[model samples]
Target: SPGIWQLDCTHLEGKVILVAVHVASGYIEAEVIPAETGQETAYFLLKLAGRWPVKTVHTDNGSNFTSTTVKAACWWAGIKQEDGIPYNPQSQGVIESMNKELKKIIGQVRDQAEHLKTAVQMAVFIHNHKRKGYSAGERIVDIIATDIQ
Candidate 1:
C-alpha cells in the first residue's frame, strides 16, 4: 500500500548511512556509504527495484537527489519523484519521526554492535518485530529477504 520513502541520510559515528523507510508498516532499509549522492542512492534503489519495485519517491530538495543522474535512474525504473514542500515543516511526512526512532535505536545499541550495518539492521528488525507486532513485518521482510537470497 505504501509507495514512497522520504529518502535521507544520517551519520553513524562520523560515517554516513543512507536510509529509506516504507511509508506504511514502518519497514526500513539502509546501507552505509562514504558519502550521500544520487548516484549512491540510485545504486541502492536500483538494487531495491529488483526487490520491492517502488512506484514513487520523495526527498528533500537536495541537489544530489534532484540531479540528472538520479532523475534518469529513477525514471528509467518507472518511479515518480516528489519533492518535500518548500518550507512546510509537516511536508516530508513520517520520515523524520521514523528517523528519530532509528536514531534512538542506534544510540541505544550502537556500542554493542560490531558493525554499522548490523546496528542499522537491528533497528530495522526491531522496528518490524517488536514495534509493529510481528505479523505484517514478518511478511514484508520475507518478501524482501527473498530478494536477498
Candidate 2:
C-alpha cells in the first residue's frame, strides 16, 4: 500500500479532491475543495450523511487529518475519526485499497483522452454498483434498517 502523501499544491491546478464509494453498495461521498488541508477534509466528512449515522472515519495522520479543523469537525459530528500512526499505511487498509482501484480506473480512462471525463464517470458508477463483497453480495443499494416506528 502507498503511504499517505500530500499532493504538491504548486503542481495541482485548481482544487485537490478525493471521493470514495463502498464498492459493495452505492454509498458514495466526495470532497472537492481548493486545498486538501485539515479543515477542508473535516468539512467533507461532515457532509457524509444527511440523516444516517456515520460510525467512524479512518485516515492516516496526514496534515489534513491531524489539523484542528478535522478534529473539531469529528467532535461536532459525533463520529470518531481514526488516524493511523504517522508512518503506518496498513492501518487504513480499506481506503488504501480504494485508492489503488480508483487509480486503475482513472488510468484506463485517461488512455482515451478525448472522452476521459465521461469514461471516468462511467467507471466510478460501475465500480460502486458492480463490485461485490462477502457482506452483501450484488446489492446495488446500501439498505439500512431504522427504528423509526
Candidate 3:
C-alpha cells in the first residue's frame, strides 16, 4: 500500500527534464518537457502514474511542484505529494545523482526537442537495464521482466 518515490527536475539547453527514482528497485523514469511550468509537470506526473504504481511523490520546494495545477493532478491521480525538507540532500539524493548522468546523456544529443526526447528514452533504458547494488545484483528491467512473467 506504500511505495516511496523521489522526484526532481533539471534544466538543460532550454528544456526541463523531469526525473523520478523508485527507492526500492532503483528504477528511473526521465522525461523532457519544453517548460517547467505547473501544467507541464502535472501532465508528466499523470503520464508517470500511467506507467507505474505511484503512491507518494517526494519533491523539493520548487514553484513548479507547489502549484495548484500539480496538486490537482496529484489529487486526481491519487498520489500523495510531499514537499521534502528544504536544502536536505538525503531526501533527493537518488534523483539528484541520476540527473547528473541524464544530463551527460542529453548533452551528447542535438539539444532539439525530438533529439532530447530520444536521448532521454535511451538514457532511461540504459539506467534501468544496468545492475544496481540496491537491486541486489539484478537489473531493474530484468526484475520487472520476471515480475511480469
**Tens digits of lDDT, candidate 3, 54-103:** 88887645785579998999999989998766465664565576778777
Best by lDDT: 3
Backbone clashes in model 2: 1
- Taking all chains together, the TM-score of candidate 1 against the true structure is 0.77
Q: What shift in Å separates residue 50 of candidate 1 from its native position after superposition?
A: 1.4
User: Once all C-alphas are superposed, what RMSD does model 3 give against the true structure?
Assistant: 4.1
Error of 3 at 86 (Å): 6.4
Candidate order by decreasing lDDT? 3, 1, 2
Which 10-residue window of candidate 3 scores lowest in summed lDDT?
132-141
Q: Flag regions of model 1 displaced more than 4 Å.
A: 86-88, 91-93, 132-149
Per-residue lDDT tens digits for candidate 1, residues 40-125, read 87887776666675777776457755788788878888878777453656645555676788889987888888888788878876
Pairs of colliding residues, candidate 2? 38-64
- lDDT score of model 1? 0.71
Off by over 4 Å in 2: 1-15, 20-28, 85-95, 110-121, 133-143, 146-149
**Per-candidate TM vs. native?**
0.77, 0.57, 0.76
